[PDB]
Amino acid sequence: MILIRNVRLVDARGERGPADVLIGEGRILSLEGGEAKQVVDGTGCFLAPGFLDLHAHLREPGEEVKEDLFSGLLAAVRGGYTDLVSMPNTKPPVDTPEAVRALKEKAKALGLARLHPAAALTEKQEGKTLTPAGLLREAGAVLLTDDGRTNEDAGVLAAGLLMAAPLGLPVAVHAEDAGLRRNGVMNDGPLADLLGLPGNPPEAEAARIARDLEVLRYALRRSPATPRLHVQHLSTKRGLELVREAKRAGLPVTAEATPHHLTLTEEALRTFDPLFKVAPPLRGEEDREALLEGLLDGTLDAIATDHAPHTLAEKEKDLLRAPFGIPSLEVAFPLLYTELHLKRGFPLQRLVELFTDGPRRVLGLPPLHLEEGAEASLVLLSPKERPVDPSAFASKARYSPWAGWVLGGWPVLTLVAGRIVHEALK
Template sequence: MKGDFLIKKAKLVDGRGVHGTADVLIGEGRILSLSGGEAPSVLDASGMILSPGFFDPHAHLREPGQEVKEDLQSGLTAAARGGYTDIVSMPNTTPVVDNPEIVAALKKKAAQIQQARLHPAAALTQGQEGKVLSEAHRLQEAGAVMLTDDGKTNEDAGVLAQGLLYAASWGLVVAVHAEDAGLRRNGVMNEGAVSYRLGLPGNSGYAESARIARDLEVVRYVLDRLAAKAAPDRLLHIQHLSTRRGLELIRQAKHQGLPVTTEVGPHHLTLTEEALNGLNPLYKVAPPLRTQSDVEALIEGLLDGSIDCIGTDHAPHTQDEKELDLLRAPFGIPSLEVCWPLLYTELVEKRGFPLDVLVARFTDGPRRVLGFPPLHLEEGAEASLVLWNPSAQRAVEPQTFASKARFSPWAGWELKGWPVCTWVEGQMVCKAMEGEGIGQSAP
């Protein structure tokens, strides 16, 4: 059998488990064989792991209108460098992605870039103003995979309910930034002992849990309205979960059968409010970094499946913006290129977190949230893959990022698990930086 690439001696890990070593033949955009074959390009993957490509359900790529921070070229390249084959872009751009023409234009441009695949999210409401709903059906036809006013909170429960009803009609999920604006106020960090000591305005964890509680009641209301129809298996997606209490509410809702999903970001799994002791705005995110107790709860939720997936919430800004003081600097951390090695190192290597479960949260989990079929390592499956090195270690060096946001709260951290090759539908879109140990030869 002949193909385009032969990946020799790769250990296979997907969301179903850790498998043996195989010689994976790729051709015609698919996995042709797991037992070798002929190809013009042969990669020696000894000691490396092959997984389905990662899928990020939550990233800010800033195009259109904010290209000084990031654009599709830099963002999708950064995603491929991080092992992502698919990425959902948020609509809080300039202008807001709230009409089908913008969605279609983004899809067309991204396809020409030929890096990670782009799946645009569109605004739930026009202009993300929380008042008038966007046209869900037309947005879906143009290629939108999610409706969300992310970056803003949905204050009008009635508008959210109507949006959920419309979204259900077209098989779309609605994602929400779950923070109560009245409780959040102007907080720049978690409200608690550290914020009190520093004299900084705090954002209480109850801002998140109070809004989650309300939104879950809205879901129940919508399900009552849909009683005569088949209830959707996914409807509300809660973004960037950060608190133990919020997780408790979601876990309970899932046990009751509500069509609710959630994600957690790498920063809420690896950093706490203590990082703000130095007043460094690199650690300023929304929702804010919480306590170690919250971190432990979120890791447990990731393990038991209460948390469905990892969403980076990749949020690039200019260097000048992030060098402002803590009160004025914008919220956000860039993380596309470090998310996998960070969580592999901090969870699998240091805590013994099951590798296949982590892979599932990067692959099957986000796909399920968005209604995409799972992607596993089997003959005939789409060859959207990432090959990564579980043993080679190097430090996070933001100056080498493909992203325009060349800063990181993890700068200098020594990590393992760095991606070395990424394929999208059988096409290699990213290869390891020089010296990262992948051999290539003729057959």
């Protein structure tokens, strides 16, 4: 039982308060105060529903040295997440009910962020044979994806959507046409040529998204149930336009954007620093600007991390040999609260919506609002400014493309159904 006084309330519906929030019995008991032995002065802070990440690579099983559920779910709660979706590109890939159950059992024993695991669309994510979606859902899978991997065979993706539709399992795709991407290490264009690096055409992403939207129409026709397509990390202006028009046309497609594609651009590669090597690549300012507009108009349904950790040593190899990936679980919200809300005037309720309601709806889960009687899975954000300090990360990837960045909006308290899983009141 906890009482948070003089705090602002913020969920997708809007900003309210200051108010005194009484939490107990795992729920929000009152928004008009009450009595409690544990009292938190939330002056200047705002309370929001616990966040939910749709795209996190936790490196377990198989590559625990990079990350594992212990470090990953801890980093998650420190980042304000009370719910998280793990990707299946592990060693070996999560494509069986037992693998799904194992992850869920461990996440329950640890009792930090809620694990909602994703399973592969195809066995070993090799893109040839569909997995047993029915059994996977029964075990707890919330979405199917071969992510990491692209889906080159349109027939498999189509069949995948048909298998998933009646199960209510969204199919999330890493939309890049491998044929046109070739083995680009950064965004293709003038800068790539200036740096003498093989480019990955942003059109490679537009091409695959365009294809998939037509494949989705096929699923709509052939399936009795409504299929669900989710475009992962969307990074280009053209890709955004494609999704915007598909939505206008009424297609059941959703999309997410990552913290790095919203704050960084290809320009960051002028040093050949692998810390900025990611898939899909960082794009141009024009693309980044378009995404911000996409966040506002609703074309983008959620902000997902695509938390992809590796070891510092690996990230210290030559740019061409270094792995693709950026970690961000612990900095995602403060980063965007600072760069988008404070510096660009981006609406706070909309930003919070993108970390809550949006992600939950993508999965088909009911929204969690700050209202009396609601489950007390919340996060308290502080305006205090402090730099991103990798050495202090709970995540094992002790590095960051935003290292040193002075940000406000860091979580100082995270609760999962009333239980304190993270506290840094300061």
